[PDB]
Symmetry: none
Subunit: 226 residues, 6 copies
Amino acid sequence: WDIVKATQYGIYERCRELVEAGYDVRQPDKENVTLLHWAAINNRIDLVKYYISKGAIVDQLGGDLNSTPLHWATRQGHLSMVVQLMKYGADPSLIDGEGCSCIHLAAQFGHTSIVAYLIAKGQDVDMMDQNGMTPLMWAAYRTHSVDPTRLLLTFNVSVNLGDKYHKNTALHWAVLAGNTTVISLLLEAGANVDAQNIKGESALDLAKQRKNVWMINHLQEARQAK
Amino acid sequence: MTHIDDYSTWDIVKATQYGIYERCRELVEAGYDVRQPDKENVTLLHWAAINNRIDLVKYYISKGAIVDQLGGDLNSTPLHWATRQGHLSMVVQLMKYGADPSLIDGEGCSCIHLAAQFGHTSIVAYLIAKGQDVDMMDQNGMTPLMWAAYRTHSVDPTRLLLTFNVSVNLGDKYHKNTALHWAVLAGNTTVISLLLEAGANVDAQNIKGESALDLAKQRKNVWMINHLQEAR
Amino acid sequence: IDDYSTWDIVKATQYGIYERCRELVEAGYDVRQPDKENVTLLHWAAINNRIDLVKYYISKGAIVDQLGGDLNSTPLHWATRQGHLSMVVQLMKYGADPSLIDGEGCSCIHLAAQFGHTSIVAYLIAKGQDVDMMDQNGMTPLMWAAYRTHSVDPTRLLLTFNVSVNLGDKYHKNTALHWAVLAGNTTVISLLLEAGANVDAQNIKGESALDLAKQRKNVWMINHLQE
Amino acid sequence: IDDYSTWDIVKATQYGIYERCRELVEAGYDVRQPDKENVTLLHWAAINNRIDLVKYYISKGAIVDQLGGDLNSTPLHWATRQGHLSMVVQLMKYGADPSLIDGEGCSCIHLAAQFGHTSIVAYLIAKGQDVDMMDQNGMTPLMWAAYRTHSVDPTRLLLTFNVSVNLGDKYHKNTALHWAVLAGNTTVISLLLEAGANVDAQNIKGESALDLAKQRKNVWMINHLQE
Amino acid sequence: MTHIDDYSTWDIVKATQYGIYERCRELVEAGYDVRQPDKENVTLLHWAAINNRIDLVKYYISKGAIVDQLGGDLNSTPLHWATRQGHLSMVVQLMKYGADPSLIDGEGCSCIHLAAQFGHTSIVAYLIAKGQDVDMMDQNGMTPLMWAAYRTHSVDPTRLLLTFNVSVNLGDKYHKNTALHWAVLAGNTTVISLLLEAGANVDAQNIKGESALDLAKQRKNVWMINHLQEAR
Amino acid sequence: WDIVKATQYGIYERCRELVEAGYDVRQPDKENVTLLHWAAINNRIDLVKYYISKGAIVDQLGGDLNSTPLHWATRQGHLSMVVQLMKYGADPSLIDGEGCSCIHLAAQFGHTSIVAYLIAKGQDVDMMDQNGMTPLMWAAYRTHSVDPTRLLLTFNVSVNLGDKYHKNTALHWAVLAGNTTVISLLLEAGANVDAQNIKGESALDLAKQRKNVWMINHLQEARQAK
């Protein structure tokens, strides 16, 4: 196959053949994606080492959303690839076309093991992406599961931060997404039920709007406990 | 939060296992010593950890619980239990309180070895990120790679371990069996494939002069015999 | 959460899903019918602070002081234990008798005292309850708090209601001061001493309070009780 | 901290340094003497929950209901505002009259109501205070809570004490429901409605409650009041 | 916590400046709009920030306060005020809430420039650590180094700035005066010494063809004249 | 002077002269201290760059307490030197002879600006040193000032952790040191007044032992608020 397909499919020998034949590892395709992006998103550990040894730019931006290879690996959820790229100096704090850094991508796609690894390596657990969203907010809005929310709360995130543009706290986002699993976790961690967003709505107002009695009762009870 | 059972009759151990915070706090308030282990010598902290009760773990510790208290049949710490069970958040929490993942359980294993043998890949990565030696040899002379090779018939955690800077050809302190030998002995074809690709020396001999190949032949496993043969 | 509109009456009651509870009772569920554990809907409503369900269930014939649970307690006993003041007030406003006794010989004031529910202790006493009222254990509200609450209140409150400090229970015949010591409650010790507690008073076992402090070897105690 | 053994009587009182306070009063400081702000030591002791100093100062001649501060209030008014139940109980146990009025026409129950102090509201009512008692503003405990407390209580509690929901103050002649709306208190609105509040009742200005909801354009309100 | 004054008569602004949490919460509870600015168009958030009232800042934000609301005579944000005053903890807190340090105040300056001109070295370092460009030119055409050279007659923050990868010979967008020129114009001998040691081009001319030396001579400052002369 | 003194006194030209003359920059002195340690502790920025360019080992352990040059700079409180060494790859998490990493050294000596820089660069705010102490505990025990305690609390540290060996929380340590300034900050941040250390003493027990009425009242009041 062509080098791109060989990379995507992980045919090591074939890639090494074309490269030695003269192919430039920095040569992007039509959509401006580099071989390292394809290797990263497909978890081709050996190919990543090889291409980088051949001069591949580790954090080269590419794709319709100007993302780095590590951004792609994080989205796909390849823990081993995240480790590998970071070993070669990939910077997880870099921002992609959607305004997200690796920690936000890990949180919105529920890749709990990657969230843990990134935090253990120094990533700011309260980091706001360019959309004004923190990892906790993304988890509350996108992951209807105990993790990664539980993990993030264990790392002691700021539970009551409101996103930069809508001032929606993680609790606001959980109510808006009908994420009941996360609501309980947030309330137990001290989420402020009366904090108001830019429209003057508290998470409780949102619960009532949604007409969810279980939510209304829990939020009211949390207030009484606060 | 919501009372869905009559806990006024539940004993401390049961309320801990089920995570009934309020009932545990009550019994401790009544005068129960959080350091008092049950018949099996298990502490409330062990029960809370293996059941992933994060809030209770913090409460018990504030009340006097010994963080790395050894207990149970296997003489292990609450962190060892949390690791075996695979509760990443509990591992994170206990380590925050100072629980030491390098401690040895009653079977000679530290946390990284337990995580490896029970295939808890995310915990293996977290522990390494926190400073644990990827090549740490336990008291059985086994490294995490060896444990994965002998007990995890799957791609991970072997692939993750190999991704870090692991020494593929180390032999265990006693038998001098490499990860490759253990894979053969376990009939773990999945890992054998990963090790060979990683450069495992097919001719490495243990103290019996046996190489990984010699063990494959002795087992008469055609699959293994040819794979290693082609590998070399 | 996962569609509470299909939850059984007991669960709907516990979580306060009013309309689901009304719907099921109207459809035929008797509000007096106990569950497997022998607990009535009123018990579950009271402990979960479901004021609305409490009014509704009682209006349906629910027995207010119906005894239930392993400890044979009334819904009020349950509300008192959890520290729900508004519920204690509501139940009582419906004929709930706080003087009743549970499977432990304790009344509401004793329960409110041993669980540190100060606001309830104050309400019950203002409603009539005797500050020195003893349970079937000879224990007084002061003895309980001194023995179970490591904090200024309810103790300090009780002392305000001019309670007799040197009274002793029946069986063991211990003073609030003896219990405080056994519980290692130095906060209470201070309050009792300033209240004129008898540091030499002996229990029905010979122990003279300070004696227990000695047996406990607690430095703080031995010194303050001595002084 | 920085040697409280040298602090003046007012500061020692505020921080509860008992021995320093006793020392200074015995040395000649009159406990009735007000400070620059015209506040007495009893006021400072009450608001800072200094139960011990309260007993001591009163035993020294301190005037219990002495009016002080810009708002001309008594020590009990201060305790009530801060929500110190044990203090309210203690003061009253010394002749403190909760029915007195401060520089705003408010009594203790009105203060406890507007500041959301449920446990105190319950105590005062059980001690005699009239649930419908109106202040020099014609405001009732229900109107205040409905207007100042965005929570189930004290409102829900008051409703339990069978308070008249359709009563209106003097001046403005507003119902607890009108105030609740103006305050944007949807939690209270619900409680009042279920209590049988008059959604059509008009104020001394013509406003018919729902009217204000319309003027407020609040979607939630307009719908629930309508229904 | 301890009531040491009668706050029942204090207005929201005063209680904010003094950090009387309970009294502020009360007034807001009574119906005060936290977004309502005073006569000078200053918001309660500005007052809380410049007075280092961390707890109030969080409370006001939860109540609806606009984090980067511009206000005051100089049309600045609460973060700008906190930066000018030099409250590192408040800068940290506001940035956690999303306050943007790159925003411009009514005098064309961003936070890094304010920190530099008022000599708040710790804040300069924190902002750079958080991603602010050490060479960021404000709307007056001034970099942090230039501001330090023109306004801080001290070793820091110039030494710290020079420690990062700052471009010593950039000229301001309008006058083309380098940090060296500004130091001369300010008679800041302390900084002149630091710049020369750092490699500042003594012959760099501004748009008037004047070099740092030319300005020293025009000022007839013997000290400066000889120092720069010996430097070149 | 000799090269050591020239380094300590910052005589650049003189050091460069001796080095070019043949002196090995890795040559330690009697106490096993390297030229980089002397340059670091004396804030000699230029000399640090120079010695590293000549092969100096950045994190070389030295001195009676086996510390790195960055450890020395942190102790002395040189923010510029901390920045410089970290720029050259110095690892602040390394442990010195006393079991401390840079963040603990920064906290115990009250170097607030360095604590902030280290955290901004990824250091774990709850990091326990080998003595079982966190930065917050060291600040509570050693710094009788608002900072760095206030700063640490802003970064959302775990307020109730007990040290590994004595189980003393930051609040216990503050009481033991008679650090009233810090006590108020900790209580406001939710410090647990009843948490017990290994001897079964709560911070309140310690306050009573100390016979400090101001402390006793504040801790008791905090309990009532909790």
